Design an enzyme around this catalytic site. Sequence first.
Site, mmCIF file in Angstrom:
data_model
loop_
_atom_site.group_PDB
_atom_site.id
_atom_site.type_symbol
_atom_site.label_atom_id
_atom_site.label_comp_id
_atom_site.label_asym_id
_atom_site.label_seq_id
_atom_site.Cartn_x
_atom_site.Cartn_y
_atom_site.Cartn_z
ATOM 1 N N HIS B 109 21.513 15.520 32.988
ATOM 2 C CA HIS B 109 21.570 16.959 33.243
ATOM 3 C C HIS B 109 22.969 17.606 33.105
ATOM 4 C CE1 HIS B 109 20.499 20.722 35.532
ATOM 5 N NE2 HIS B 109 19.367 20.540 34.866
ATOM 6 N N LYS B 111 26.182 19.346 31.240
ATOM 7 C CA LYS B 111 26.412 20.270 30.146
ATOM 8 C C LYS B 111 27.904 20.381 29.844
ATOM 9 C CE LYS B 111 22.978 22.231 32.964
ATOM 10 N NZ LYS B 111 21.841 21.459 32.462
ATOM 11 N N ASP B 116 39.240 16.451 21.774
ATOM 12 C CA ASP B 116 40.482 15.701 21.511
ATOM 13 C C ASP B 116 41.070 15.009 22.745
ATOM 14 O OD1 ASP B 116 40.144 16.610 18.914
ATOM 15 O OD2 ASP B 116 41.912 17.908 18.917
#
Lengths: 165, 165
Positions: B109, B111, B116
Amino acid sequence: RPRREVLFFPSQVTCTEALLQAPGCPCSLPHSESSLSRLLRALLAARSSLELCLFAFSSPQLGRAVQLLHQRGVRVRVITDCDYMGSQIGLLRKAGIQVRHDQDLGYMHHKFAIVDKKVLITGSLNWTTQAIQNNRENVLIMEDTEYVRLFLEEFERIWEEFDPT
Amino acid sequence: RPRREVLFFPSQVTCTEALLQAPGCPCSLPHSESSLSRLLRALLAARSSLELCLFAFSSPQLGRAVQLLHQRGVRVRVITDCDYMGSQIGLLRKAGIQVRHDQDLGYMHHKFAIVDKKVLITGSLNWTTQAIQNNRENVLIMEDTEYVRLFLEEFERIWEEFDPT
Ligand SMILES: [Zn+2]
Ligand SMILES: [Zn+2]
């Protein structure tokens, strides 16, 4: 100096009876810290105000924490996506906590809390037992004046938009 | 000095044709910045590596951005909750981008994205056009060495857990 923590979930299952001032520890769970106990402690540190802006809120542990803060004189304001009309939001509302809400359409998708206008708690985590115990999630806990400012501004915009009057 | 931004959604609808190197601007949309264009720019700043750990990913604009990074030689690794088996994840996979995945049960779940090994992008936002254009959401963009370290550690744990071999 400034708090910057991250909690990763799923949370270890640990005892929170003392933390949540259980009525009446001899239980079988570990008596040590977890991602959930850390989240509970961050909230229970509130002395003045709590703003909650949450897509979903059904955790009885987190509900109990918010209850205790309201009973302590903390100014609690809650925004959720669903009106929840024995739910936690129902129990908070009954206790006199102001709750405002969206259309239960998915639109109010924030998962944050602001403690005493100084600590921002924000993550991917919906405040449900299922998510807490099973999902890979993150919750940030930050003492950051700019993030708190900007999140409080967003909160107040949504708060006024959902004024039942 | 260190980047600390927050983007709030819903995003204003603005033109991203030039940003996404459209083939072939005379369009009717505003040619100014939005929460989506800011997110796109943060990603397109990648020169070396991109880790993506996303519950859902269907936005064609964000898909195009990730495509371009892969074509530029950026090392892209993606974890999603669903395997998506004309989806964006399907198109990324076909292009040779390594994608690993969960059970499509809700468990993965997060996000977030790591650019880099120095910028963390994390929020409530699922990378879908519907959420971007309609939902109240937040995305943080942070140059923070400790958060990047801890999120990269989490990413690598999940990456290895989902190794198809
Ligand atoms: Zn106990
Ligand atoms: Zn245009």
